[PDB]
Ligand binder design. Structure first.
Ligand SMILES: [Ca+2]
Ligand SMILES: [Ca+2]
Length: 84
């Protein structure tokens, strides 16, 4: 319960930035395109992240999936929340 709705706004803003078209699902091309912001990453790493973030395995990450994974590494989202 310590988690508040304000935090979701951060995850929603970060997940919303990944969704290129905004269909609720992010594909390697979408996540990879946003990941490019790192300026030092490869497509094979972005594809692996999806295989790890993809809870069902449909090939895309949804806000719900990103949230479940964001909780496993909240400290990770704080790093991307600064890149954008
Ligand atoms: Ca999408
Ligand atoms: Ca999925």
């Amino acid at each position: 319960a310590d988690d508040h709705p304000q935090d979701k706004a951060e995850r929603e803003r970060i997940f919303k930035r990944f969704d290129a078209n905004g269909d609720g699902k992010i594909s390697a091309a979408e996540l990879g395109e946003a990941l490019k912001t790192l300026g030092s990453i490869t497509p094979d790493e972005v594809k692996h992240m999806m295989a790890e973030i993809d809870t069902d395995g449909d090939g895309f990450i949804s806000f719900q999936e990103f949230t479940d994974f964001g909780r496993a590494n909240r400290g990770l989202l704080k790093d991307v929340a600064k890149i954008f």
